[PDB]
Structures are given as structure tokens and as C-alpha cells.
Amino acid sequence: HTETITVEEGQTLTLKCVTSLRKNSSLQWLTPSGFTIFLNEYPALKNSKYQLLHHSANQLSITVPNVTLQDEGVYKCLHYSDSVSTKEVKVIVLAT
Amino acid sequence: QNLFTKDVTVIEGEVATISCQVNKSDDSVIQLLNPNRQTIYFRDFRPLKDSRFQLLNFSSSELKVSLTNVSISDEGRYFCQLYTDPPQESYTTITVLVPP
């Protein structure tokens, strides 16, 4: 758990995962509910509001527009190289 | 629920076959995760650098994977995910028995 982000209800949350640069690697964002938002450039959750902001070998960044209180929780970014590293980002949503 | 799987018992050192089945498929993404919820297969793509995993079959209705030279460290819940809206999840438990 390396980061905690506070965002206000109704604004845009940006989740940026920047890692070491490794050949033949993958990057992935997971929701608190444990489902894939993107694996590399490929979306998984469908009909969703998540937007791909940037994908390259050492960066996967996504936008969570129009944040609701239920978008709170621990999101995870996984980096698949010789081993799998995980960054955990706790999102706090402020009401009002 | 449209997504199903089945528990697996395997002798240590042998080959486990793990399958995620979809009834009445609409071609939503099928994913298989390991016990640490790391992706083994996303459709036919394997991001996980463990060449003991191989793809046995991939279709609209099935993602079937083998794990060769299973060890006790591989024991546990493997998660099938189906990206319908809302998505579904069903896990299979892999039990590893002592070798001969």
C-alpha cells in the first residue's frame, strides 16, 4: 500500500501506475471489487465509465470520471515481468 | 449464473487441467486467475511468466488451461471471471495430493 488519494464526489479521479521498464511485461488495474479495468490496452469491465488515459510499457493510467461515493476502496495495479509486483492505491471519496 | 468450473485434485508433480465454462455465451471476456488473484490467462493471452501454464482450448464457451509439474505451492482457489455486465466469478479449488 504505497498511496492514498482523496477525491471529491463528482470530480475526476486519475489512477496512474508508473513502474520499472521491462521487456515483454504487462500492466493491469483492478477495481476494489476485484475485476479488471484494463489489462494493457484491453478493457475487461464493459459498459463502464473507466477511460484509458495512457498505456505504454512502464505506464498504465486510467480516468474514473464523475466519481461517486461507491468508487471508494483499494484499487490495485499489477506489473507482470519475471515476477508480479502489486501497488495498492486507497481511494477516499469526500461527500458533498 | 452462466459461468461454471469444477474442483481439481492432482498428484504433486503431475498435470492439472483447469477449465472455465460458459453457458449461452455472448463472447464476453473470460479470465482465469491464480490464488493470489493474478491473471494467468486473459482470453488466449498469458501475462504471467510461468511457462508451466499452457492453453489447451479457447473458444466462445471455454477457457481450458493445463498446469504442468504442479507443486503444493500451486494449491488453492483459481478464479474464473466472465465479463458480462455485471461480471461473474466462480472459483475452483485445486487440491494437491502427495506424490507416489
From Swiss-Prot, chain A:
Glycans are attached at residue 66. Changing residue 46 to A: Reduced binding to CADM1. Severely impairs interaction with CADM1. It is found in: Cell membrane. Residues 1-93 form the Ig-like V-type domain. In the immune system, expression is restricted to activated class-I MHC-restricted cells, including NKT and CD8 T-cells. Strongly expressed in spleen, thymus, small intestine, peripheral blood leukocyte, and in Purkinje neurons in cerebellum. Expressed at much lower levels in testis, ovary, colon, lung and lymphoid tissues. Mediates heterophilic cell-cell adhesion which regulates the activation, differentiation and tissue retention of various T-cell subsets. Interaction with CADM1 promotes natural killer (NK) cell cytotoxicity and IFNG/interferon-gamma secretion by CD8+ T-cells in vitro as well as NK cell-mediated rejection of tumors expressing CADM1 in vivo. Regulates CD8+ T-cell proliferation in response to T-cell receptor (TCR) activation. Appears to be dispensable for CD8+ T-cell-mediated cytotoxicity. Monomer. May form homodimer (via Ig-like V-type domain). Interacts (via Ig-like V-type domain) with CADM1 (via Ig-like V-type domain); the interaction competes with CRTAM homodimerization and CADM1 homodimerization. Interacts (via PDZ-binding motif) with SCRIB (via PDZ domain 3); the interaction promotes CRTAM and SCRIB polarization in a subset of CD4+ T-cells. The extracellular domain is required for the regulation of IFNG and IL22 production, but is dispensable for late T-cell polarization. Belongs to the nectin family. This is Cytotoxic and regulatory T-cell molecule. It comes from Homo sapiens (Human).
Swiss-Prot record, chain B:
Glycosylation at Asn-23 and Asn-57 promotes adhesive binding and synapse induction. Disulfide bonds join 20-80. Residues 1-95 form the Ig-like V-type domain. Glycans are attached at residues 23, 57, 69. It is found in: Cell membrane; Synapse. Belongs to the nectin family. The cytoplasmic domain appears to play a critical role in proapoptosis and tumor suppressor activity in NSCLC. Homodimer (via Ig-like V-type domain). Interacts with FARP1. Interacts (via Ig-like V-type domain) with CRTAM (via Ig-like V-type domain); the interaction competes with CRTAM homodimerization and CADM1 homodimerization. Interacts (via C-terminus) with EPB41L3/DAL1. The interaction with EPB41L3/DAL1 may act to anchor CADM1 to the actin cytoskeleton. Interacts (via C-terminus) with MPP2 (via PDZ domain). Interacts (via C-terminus) with MPP3 (via PDZ domain); this interaction connects CADM1 with DLG1. Interacts (via C-terminus) with PALS2 (via PDZ domain). (Microbial infection) Interacts with herpes virus 8 proteins vFLIP and vGPCR; these interactions are essential for NF-kappa-B activation. Mediates homophilic cell-cell adhesion in a Ca(2+)-independent manner. Also mediates heterophilic cell-cell adhesion with CADM3 and NECTIN3 in a Ca(2+)-independent manner. Interaction with CRTAM promotes natural killer (NK) cell cytotoxicity and interferon-gamma (IFN-gamma) secretion by CD8+ cells in vitro as well as NK cell-mediated rejection of tumors expressing CADM1 in vivo. In mast cells, may mediate attachment to and promote communication with nerves. CADM1, together with MITF, is essential for development and survival of mast cells in vivo. This is Cell adhesion molecule 1. It comes from Homo sapiens (Human). The chain holds residues 45 to 144 of 442 of the full protein.
